[model samples]
Target: ATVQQLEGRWRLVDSKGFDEYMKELGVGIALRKMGAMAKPDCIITCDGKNLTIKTESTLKTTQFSCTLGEKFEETTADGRKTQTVCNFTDGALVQHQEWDGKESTITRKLKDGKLVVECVMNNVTCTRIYEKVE
Candidate 1:
């Protein structure tokens, strides 16, 4: 898929491995504990060269941006810093992400069923199916 293929807004509906991922990322004890209980509301918007995403929940909020195929630095709301690279995986506009000095990789895909988005990563893989917001 091309850039236009992913040029829209998406919301996160379900996820897995986020809790442990946050802990391993060095989030503070309080925040990390709170993070486990917090249901993150994450959104992604793509506009030509600019791609932005914001993750928010009861505990904290984080946002980041980058141009397609560019290197970018991201800081979690809890103050954990990391590097990220996002790219297309298949014709379905799948998104593959590598972060923290290439320590892990995540792949996001749109399955052909009721807006189900699938994600897979090394230690903290998650799937964030969504409904059309507009």
Candidate 2:
């Protein structure tokens, strides 16, 4: 599926290894606990080659705007600055992030009419599932 195929509202359904992964990424304990409690909703919109994604939760709202294969600067949820590049591979939208010499990748795709995201860093993995809000 293309990134445009993911243009819709979505809510978190399940998560695995997320907290551990955040901790490994140096997230503070309190913020990690807050993250555990926050169930964010995602709103995605695509206009031509540009993609906009907004994640809203009780604790925070984050927005990302970019075009495929174009590098952009973003401050992560953890308050880290990074350069991100996104592209499509095997029907999934894959994002590559680099910061402070550390690298990570996040892949998002449609699975069973839901949005599935897999994040990898330093060989550790976290998967988050979201159901389309229809």
Tens digit of per-residue lDDT, candidate 1, span 1-134: 45445444555556566666655555678886776676565566778767776766667677888886776776647664657667665644434444555355544445553244444444555445655456
Which one wins on lDDT? 2
RMSD of 1: 3.5
| Model 2 regions more than 4 Å off | none
TM-score of each: 0.67, 0.96
Summed backbone clashes in each candidate are 0, 0
Looking at model 2, residue 110 earns an lDDT score of 92
| Whole-model lDDT per candidate | 0.59, 0.89
Tens digit of per-residue lDDT, candidate 2, span 1-134 = 56689899999999998998897789998889988888999898988778888999998689999998899997888888899998878899888999989999988999999899999999889999999988
